[PDB]
């Protein structure tokens, strides 16, 4: 067992009310909005296929020229109340907002740099408007923050000289300052989600990552901090040199998910996944025909998958430069909202059920030991196999929407055939099981 000063703090899952809320929420939205929304993946007449928020990198644009996009930042159609209504209608219980992406442009008027919304034609504190509007709908607000900053010349990718160390030390102070500023300007913030912490410079400064976590927790009671921030004494990221999770929840599942049979270890800690609608576009890209775009059901499948393994899911949106959402994203939010309004008893405040995975879909477990079968793949056999853990029996099955009774036939010790509904629901659907544990 290795000695560590900057390794894991928490033993298991936090069980204070603020973390229980973080968890019970389950479904969130991600907002990526920054200067990248203006070119929308096109630079100097060339459309790049890579992630639009990385266009500065793909098109090799220098900082001074990239940040000159500030002069066109004037989202006339922006309306924070509209945004919050859209999130409410989607059924999202929280929103994660890009306060500052890699480009360094801040969506709040930071006093620690000139590359902020204050020095744009628009001028207004976009972040503060969003915080207020989402909080007015009862939606928690989480802050995405990129440590890596392409606008600050003191940033370093690695520490290869005493000059690199000096510059980077200044950079970390600048970062602390921005963070303290965010925490105190917007004290309803529930989470900081760090990105851009993979460079060797950061891995070599584990002490700073632990310090940032302690500092923010002192400033914001009950705040959650993601594992991605954290590096230990040895530069091991997410989980420390003793394999213990750092931060409050695991945050590595980006555009992919743990395997439902092979990655059951994830059920031992809190975790959150994120995803994109296209293959890899977080910021607004003007041409979505360049990669596969997920359908609503494909998105709903990933949401439920996450919850079935004890994790949250955050679906991403990349608003237009004008401050409105593109029509594909409006259609997505409305379709997810419709399905959650009907079946969201199986999602909100649900967790891992402890049952062996079956082909038809996923199980989730409610707060009162309800076991929901969320069916995505309808068997031609008309029978949904349910294999119970030791000592567990199924006393009843009920179609969630209609209350109708569903026949349960015992086929072996520990296994049943739960019939499909008499009328095919025509969409992914929920059967609620009543289970009993012998003297869950
Ligand atoms: C949440 C998403 N994170 C950003 C993509 C991060 C890519 C991470 C890759 N892995 C590192 C080790 C680097 O090689 C970097 O390319 C996206 O722009 C979104 O903000």
PDB file of C-alpha atoms in Angstrom, residues 30-228:
ATOM      1  CA  UNK A  30     -24.216  19.358 -21.545  1.00  0.00           C
ATOM      2  CA  UNK A  31     -23.869  22.788 -23.146  1.00  0.00           C
ATOM      3  CA  UNK A  32     -20.815  23.570 -25.264  1.00  0.00           C
ATOM      4  CA  UNK A  33     -20.848  27.212 -26.238  1.00  0.00           C
ATOM      5  CA  UNK A  34     -17.880  29.356 -27.049  1.00  0.00           C
ATOM      6  CA  UNK A  35     -16.249  31.205 -29.949  1.00  0.00           C
ATOM      7  CA  UNK A  36     -15.980  27.936 -31.921  1.00  0.00           C
ATOM      8  CA  UNK A  37     -19.721  28.298 -32.592  1.00  0.00           C
ATOM      9  CA  UNK A  38     -19.025  31.198 -35.000  1.00  0.00           C
ATOM     10  CA  UNK A  39     -16.872  29.425 -37.634  1.00  0.00           C
ATOM     11  CA  UNK A  40     -18.890  26.177 -36.905  1.00  0.00           C
ATOM     12  CA  UNK A  41     -16.071  23.870 -38.033  1.00  0.00           C
ATOM     13  CA  UNK A  42     -15.090  25.911 -41.127  1.00  0.00           C
ATOM     14  CA  UNK A  43     -11.889  27.982 -41.313  1.00  0.00           C
ATOM     15  CA  UNK A  44     -10.809  30.076 -44.294  1.00  0.00           C
ATOM     16  CA  UNK A  45     -13.285  28.249 -46.640  1.00  0.00           C
ATOM     17  CA  UNK A  46     -12.189  24.707 -45.496  1.00  0.00           C
ATOM     18  CA  UNK A  47     -14.745  22.623 -43.481  1.00  0.00           C
ATOM     19  CA  UNK A  48     -12.857  20.392 -41.038  1.00  0.00           C
ATOM     20  CA  UNK A  49     -14.408  17.014 -40.012  1.00  0.00           C
ATOM     21  CA  UNK A  50     -12.882  17.005 -36.499  1.00  0.00           C
ATOM     22  CA  UNK A  51     -14.691  18.328 -33.446  1.00  0.00           C
ATOM     23  CA  UNK A  52     -15.743  21.959 -34.102  1.00  0.00           C
ATOM     24  CA  UNK A  53     -14.616  23.106 -30.644  1.00  0.00           C
ATOM     25  CA  UNK A  54     -11.076  21.977 -31.593  1.00  0.00           C
ATOM     26  CA  UNK A  55     -11.082  23.998 -34.912  1.00  0.00           C
ATOM     27  CA  UNK A  56      -8.362  26.255 -33.558  1.00  0.00           C
ATOM     28  CA  UNK A  57      -6.168  23.111 -33.520  1.00  0.00           C
ATOM     29  CA  UNK A  58      -7.290  21.518 -36.831  1.00  0.00           C
ATOM     30  CA  UNK A  59      -6.814  24.713 -38.843  1.00  0.00           C
ATOM     31  CA  UNK A  60      -3.609  25.735 -36.952  1.00  0.00           C
ATOM     32  CA  UNK A  61      -5.067  29.170 -36.065  1.00  0.00           C
ATOM     33  CA  UNK A  62      -2.922  31.287 -33.672  1.00  0.00           C
ATOM     34  CA  UNK A  63      -4.426  32.573 -30.425  1.00  0.00           C
ATOM     35  CA  UNK A  64      -4.578  36.267 -31.354  1.00  0.00           C
ATOM     36  CA  UNK A  65      -6.433  35.477 -34.571  1.00  0.00           C
ATOM     37  CA  UNK A  66      -8.765  32.884 -32.982  1.00  0.00           C
ATOM     38  CA  UNK A  67      -9.714  35.199 -30.088  1.00  0.00           C
ATOM     39  CA  UNK A  68     -10.554  37.984 -32.625  1.00  0.00           C
ATOM     40  CA  UNK A  69     -13.799  35.989 -33.069  1.00  0.00           C
ATOM     41  CA  UNK A  70     -14.882  37.837 -29.860  1.00  0.00           C
ATOM     42  CA  UNK A  71     -15.620  40.805 -32.147  1.00  0.00           C
ATOM     43  CA  UNK A  72     -18.380  38.748 -33.819  1.00  0.00           C
ATOM     44  CA  UNK A  73     -19.778  37.334 -30.542  1.00  0.00           C
ATOM     45  CA  UNK A  74     -23.247  38.755 -30.491  1.00  0.00           C
ATOM     46  CA  UNK A  75     -25.893  36.031 -30.003  1.00  0.00           C
ATOM     47  CA  UNK A  76     -29.026  38.072 -30.754  1.00  0.00           C
ATOM     48  CA  UNK A  77     -31.419  35.081 -30.365  1.00  0.00           C
ATOM     49  CA  UNK A  78     -30.053  34.118 -26.893  1.00  0.00           C
ATOM     50  CA  UNK A  79     -32.719  33.760 -24.206  1.00  0.00           C
ATOM     51  CA  UNK A  80     -31.755  32.024 -20.969  1.00  0.00           C
ATOM     52  CA  UNK A  81     -35.410  31.412 -20.035  1.00  0.00           C
ATOM     53  CA  UNK A  82     -35.980  29.638 -23.339  1.00  0.00           C
ATOM     54  CA  UNK A  83     -32.951  27.462 -22.771  1.00  0.00           C
ATOM     55  CA  UNK A  84     -34.171  26.444 -19.335  1.00  0.00           C
ATOM     56  CA  UNK A  85     -37.615  25.628 -20.636  1.00  0.00           C
ATOM     57  CA  UNK A  86     -36.024  23.400 -23.302  1.00  0.00           C
ATOM     58  CA  UNK A  87     -34.037  21.545 -20.588  1.00  0.00           C
ATOM     59  CA  UNK A  88     -37.160  21.175 -18.411  1.00  0.00           C
ATOM     60  CA  UNK A  89     -39.196  19.790 -21.338  1.00  0.00           C
ATOM     61  CA  UNK A  90     -36.370  17.313 -22.105  1.00  0.00           C
ATOM     62  CA  UNK A  91     -36.627  15.959 -18.556  1.00  0.00           C
ATOM     63  CA  UNK A  92     -33.035  16.954 -17.610  1.00  0.00           C
ATOM     64  CA  UNK A  93     -32.574  17.505 -13.871  1.00  0.00           C
ATOM     65  CA  UNK A  94     -29.239  19.285 -14.388  1.00  0.00           C
ATOM     66  CA  UNK A  95     -27.166  21.096 -16.933  1.00  0.00           C
ATOM     67  CA  UNK A  96     -23.350  21.157 -17.254  1.00  0.00           C
ATOM     68  CA  UNK A  97     -22.148  24.386 -18.891  1.00  0.00           C
ATOM     69  CA  UNK A  98     -18.818  25.200 -20.534  1.00  0.00           C
ATOM     70  CA  UNK A  99     -17.663  28.205 -18.436  1.00  0.00           C
ATOM     71  CA  UNK A 100     -14.365  28.167 -20.395  1.00  0.00           C
ATOM     72  CA  UNK A 101     -13.285  25.593 -23.061  1.00  0.00           C
ATOM     73  CA  UNK A 102      -9.686  25.001 -24.325  1.00  0.00           C
ATOM     74  CA  UNK A 103      -9.864  28.216 -26.416  1.00  0.00           C
ATOM     75  CA  UNK A 104      -9.890  30.186 -23.100  1.00  0.00           C
ATOM     76  CA  UNK A 105     -12.941  32.426 -23.880  1.00  0.00           C
ATOM     77  CA  UNK A 106     -14.901  32.847 -20.663  1.00  0.00           C
ATOM     78  CA  UNK A 107     -18.722  32.918 -20.604  1.00  0.00           C
ATOM     79  CA  UNK A 108     -18.628  35.048 -17.430  1.00  0.00           C
ATOM     80  CA  UNK A 109     -16.885  38.454 -17.106  1.00  0.00           C
ATOM     81  CA  UNK A 110     -13.682  37.211 -15.467  1.00  0.00           C
ATOM     82  CA  UNK A 111     -11.451  39.944 -14.064  1.00  0.00           C
ATOM     83  CA  UNK A 112      -8.391  37.690 -14.661  1.00  0.00           C
ATOM     84  CA  UNK A 113      -8.347  37.885 -18.446  1.00  0.00           C
ATOM     85  CA  UNK A 114      -9.657  40.097 -21.220  1.00  0.00           C
ATOM     86  CA  UNK A 115     -10.929  37.071 -23.233  1.00  0.00           C
ATOM     87  CA  UNK A 116     -14.456  37.147 -21.820  1.00  0.00           C
ATOM     88  CA  UNK A 117     -18.042  37.929 -22.811  1.00  0.00           C
ATOM     89  CA  UNK A 118     -17.607  41.482 -21.344  1.00  0.00           C
ATOM     90  CA  UNK A 119     -15.320  42.453 -24.255  1.00  0.00           C
ATOM     91  CA  UNK A 120     -17.690  41.332 -26.973  1.00  0.00           C
ATOM     92  CA  UNK A 121     -20.482  43.316 -28.587  1.00  0.00           C
ATOM     93  CA  UNK A 122     -22.928  41.236 -26.518  1.00  0.00           C
ATOM     94  CA  UNK A 123     -21.252  42.220 -23.181  1.00  0.00           C
ATOM     95  CA  UNK A 124     -23.634  40.333 -20.934  1.00  0.00           C
ATOM     96  CA  UNK A 125     -22.870  37.712 -18.294  1.00  0.00           C
ATOM     97  CA  UNK A 126     -24.221  34.689 -20.217  1.00  0.00           C
ATOM     98  CA  UNK A 127     -23.184  32.305 -17.530  1.00  0.00           C
ATOM     99  CA  UNK A 128     -25.024  34.283 -14.790  1.00  0.00           C
ATOM    100  CA  UNK A 129     -28.161  34.517 -16.918  1.00  0.00           C
ATOM    101  CA  UNK A 130     -28.081  30.699 -17.426  1.00  0.00           C
ATOM    102  CA  UNK A 131     -27.461  29.976 -13.753  1.00  0.00           C
ATOM    103  CA  UNK A 132     -30.503  32.067 -12.737  1.00  0.00           C
ATOM    104  CA  UNK A 133     -32.792  30.698 -15.483  1.00  0.00           C
ATOM    105  CA  UNK A 134     -31.942  27.044 -14.852  1.00  0.00           C
ATOM    106  CA  UNK A 135     -32.193  27.465 -11.083  1.00  0.00           C
ATOM    107  CA  UNK A 136     -35.670  29.115 -11.572  1.00  0.00           C
ATOM    108  CA  UNK A 137     -36.820  25.839 -13.230  1.00  0.00           C
ATOM    109  CA  UNK A 138     -35.467  23.741 -10.350  1.00  0.00           C
ATOM    110  CA  UNK A 139     -32.531  22.567 -12.539  1.00  0.00           C
ATOM    111  CA  UNK A 140     -29.107  22.171 -10.877  1.00  0.00           C
ATOM    112  CA  UNK A 141     -26.173  23.813 -12.611  1.00  0.00           C
ATOM    113  CA  UNK A 142     -22.719  22.215 -12.993  1.00  0.00           C
ATOM    114  CA  UNK A 143     -19.630  24.000 -14.321  1.00  0.00           C
ATOM    115  CA  UNK A 144     -17.400  22.518 -16.983  1.00  0.00           C
ATOM    116  CA  UNK A 145     -13.919  24.060 -16.771  1.00  0.00           C
ATOM    117  CA  UNK A 146     -10.946  23.418 -19.058  1.00  0.00           C
ATOM    118  CA  UNK A 147      -7.601  23.638 -17.208  1.00  0.00           C
ATOM    119  CA  UNK A 148      -5.754  23.617 -20.503  1.00  0.00           C
ATOM    120  CA  UNK A 149      -5.994  27.168 -21.876  1.00  0.00           C
ATOM    121  CA  UNK A 150      -4.853  28.112 -25.385  1.00  0.00           C
ATOM    122  CA  UNK A 151      -5.418  31.878 -24.663  1.00  0.00           C
ATOM    123  CA  UNK A 152      -2.868  32.107 -21.857  1.00  0.00           C
ATOM    124  CA  UNK A 153       0.838  32.049 -22.962  1.00  0.00           C
ATOM    125  CA  UNK A 154       1.888  30.814 -19.462  1.00  0.00           C
ATOM    126  CA  UNK A 155       0.182  27.467 -20.208  1.00  0.00           C
ATOM    127  CA  UNK A 156       2.620  24.526 -20.583  1.00  0.00           C
ATOM    128  CA  UNK A 157       2.090  21.011 -22.081  1.00  0.00           C
ATOM    129  CA  UNK A 158       5.088  19.781 -20.119  1.00  0.00           C
ATOM    130  CA  UNK A 159       7.717  21.020 -17.670  1.00  0.00           C
ATOM    131  CA  UNK A 160      11.081  20.734 -19.529  1.00  0.00           C
ATOM    132  CA  UNK A 161      12.921  23.789 -17.915  1.00  0.00           C
ATOM    133  CA  UNK A 162      12.979  26.096 -14.857  1.00  0.00           C
ATOM    134  CA  UNK A 163      11.264  28.730 -17.157  1.00  0.00           C
ATOM    135  CA  UNK A 164       8.441  26.251 -17.899  1.00  0.00           C
ATOM    136  CA  UNK A 165       8.017  25.771 -14.124  1.00  0.00           C
ATOM    137  CA  UNK A 166       7.871  29.516 -13.476  1.00  0.00           C
ATOM    138  CA  UNK A 167       5.312  30.179 -16.240  1.00  0.00           C
ATOM    139  CA  UNK A 168       3.183  27.204 -15.218  1.00  0.00           C
ATOM    140  CA  UNK A 169       3.198  28.243 -11.553  1.00  0.00           C
ATOM    141  CA  UNK A 170       1.708  31.603 -12.621  1.00  0.00           C
ATOM    142  CA  UNK A 171      -0.807  29.764 -14.817  1.00  0.00           C
ATOM    143  CA  UNK A 172      -2.019  27.639 -11.850  1.00  0.00           C
ATOM    144  CA  UNK A 173      -2.519  30.821  -9.762  1.00  0.00           C
ATOM    145  CA  UNK A 174      -4.515  32.341 -12.616  1.00  0.00           C
ATOM    146  CA  UNK A 175      -6.570  29.135 -12.703  1.00  0.00           C
ATOM    147  CA  UNK A 176      -7.210  29.133  -8.943  1.00  0.00           C
ATOM    148  CA  UNK A 177      -8.318  32.736  -9.288  1.00  0.00           C
ATOM    149  CA  UNK A 178     -10.827  31.967 -12.033  1.00  0.00           C
ATOM    150  CA  UNK A 179     -12.141  29.034 -10.043  1.00  0.00           C
ATOM    151  CA  UNK A 180     -12.562  31.035  -6.792  1.00  0.00           C
ATOM    152  CA  UNK A 181     -14.272  33.718  -8.830  1.00  0.00           C
ATOM    153  CA  UNK A 182     -16.770  31.177 -10.309  1.00  0.00           C
ATOM    154  CA  UNK A 183     -17.488  29.677  -6.893  1.00  0.00           C
ATOM    155  CA  UNK A 184     -18.227  33.042  -5.273  1.00  0.00           C
ATOM    156  CA  UNK A 185     -19.963  34.775  -8.186  1.00  0.00           C
ATOM    157  CA  UNK A 186     -22.300  31.734  -8.641  1.00  0.00           C
ATOM    158  CA  UNK A 187     -22.720  30.094  -5.224  1.00  0.00           C
ATOM    159  CA  UNK A 188     -25.628  27.782  -6.350  1.00  0.00           C
ATOM    160  CA  UNK A 189     -23.138  25.755  -8.521  1.00  0.00           C
ATOM    161  CA  UNK A 190     -23.363  22.026  -7.576  1.00  0.00           C
ATOM    162  CA  UNK A 191     -20.400  20.536  -9.399  1.00  0.00           C
ATOM    163  CA  UNK A 192     -17.157  21.412 -11.141  1.00  0.00           C
ATOM    164  CA  UNK A 193     -16.344  19.106 -14.065  1.00  0.00           C
ATOM    165  CA  UNK A 194     -12.692  19.538 -15.004  1.00  0.00           C
ATOM    166  CA  UNK A 195     -11.404  18.769 -18.504  1.00  0.00           C
ATOM    167  CA  UNK A 196      -8.030  19.382 -20.193  1.00  0.00           C
ATOM    168  CA  UNK A 197      -6.089  17.897 -17.282  1.00  0.00           C
ATOM    169  CA  UNK A 198      -4.253  15.106 -19.206  1.00  0.00           C
ATOM    170  CA  UNK A 199      -1.027  17.009 -20.131  1.00  0.00           C
ATOM    171  CA  UNK A 200       2.236  16.007 -18.363  1.00  0.00           C
ATOM    172  CA  UNK A 201       2.373  19.523 -16.742  1.00  0.00           C
ATOM    173  CA  UNK A 202      -0.783  18.742 -14.776  1.00  0.00           C
ATOM    174  CA  UNK A 203       0.201  15.085 -14.027  1.00  0.00           C
ATOM    175  CA  UNK A 204       3.433  16.393 -12.476  1.00  0.00           C
ATOM    176  CA  UNK A 205       1.436  18.736 -10.205  1.00  0.00           C
ATOM    177  CA  UNK A 206      -0.933  16.396  -8.422  1.00  0.00           C
ATOM    178  CA  UNK A 207      -0.730  18.598  -5.308  1.00  0.00           C
ATOM    179  CA  UNK A 208      -2.478  21.339  -7.274  1.00  0.00           C
ATOM    180  CA  UNK A 209      -5.361  19.026  -8.318  1.00  0.00           C
ATOM    181  CA  UNK A 210      -5.974  18.012  -4.696  1.00  0.00           C
ATOM    182  CA  UNK A 211      -5.685  21.638  -3.634  1.00  0.00           C
ATOM    183  CA  UNK A 212      -8.274  22.738  -6.215  1.00  0.00           C
ATOM    184  CA  UNK A 213     -10.686  20.091  -4.922  1.00  0.00           C
ATOM    185  CA  UNK A 214     -10.186  21.088  -1.198  1.00  0.00           C
ATOM    186  CA  UNK A 215     -10.415  24.813  -2.094  1.00  0.00           C
ATOM    187  CA  UNK A 216     -13.692  24.480  -4.042  1.00  0.00           C
ATOM    188  CA  UNK A 217     -15.234  22.261  -1.381  1.00  0.00           C
ATOM    189  CA  UNK A 218     -14.505  24.962   1.266  1.00  0.00           C
ATOM    190  CA  UNK A 219     -16.085  27.652  -0.919  1.00  0.00           C
ATOM    191  CA  UNK A 220     -19.200  25.671  -2.003  1.00  0.00           C
ATOM    192  CA  UNK A 221     -20.739  23.363   0.626  1.00  0.00           C
ATOM    193  CA  UNK A 222     -21.620  19.931  -0.859  1.00  0.00           C
ATOM    194  CA  UNK A 223     -20.109  20.638  -4.274  1.00  0.00           C
ATOM    195  CA  UNK A 224     -19.165  17.568  -6.350  1.00  0.00           C
ATOM    196  CA  UNK A 225     -15.819  17.356  -8.124  1.00  0.00           C
ATOM    197  CA  UNK A 226     -15.091  14.914 -10.994  1.00  0.00           C
ATOM    198  CA  UNK A 227     -12.316  12.347 -11.022  1.00  0.00           C
ATOM    199  CA  UNK A 228     -10.848  13.829 -14.237  1.00  0.00           C
TER     200      UNK A 228
END
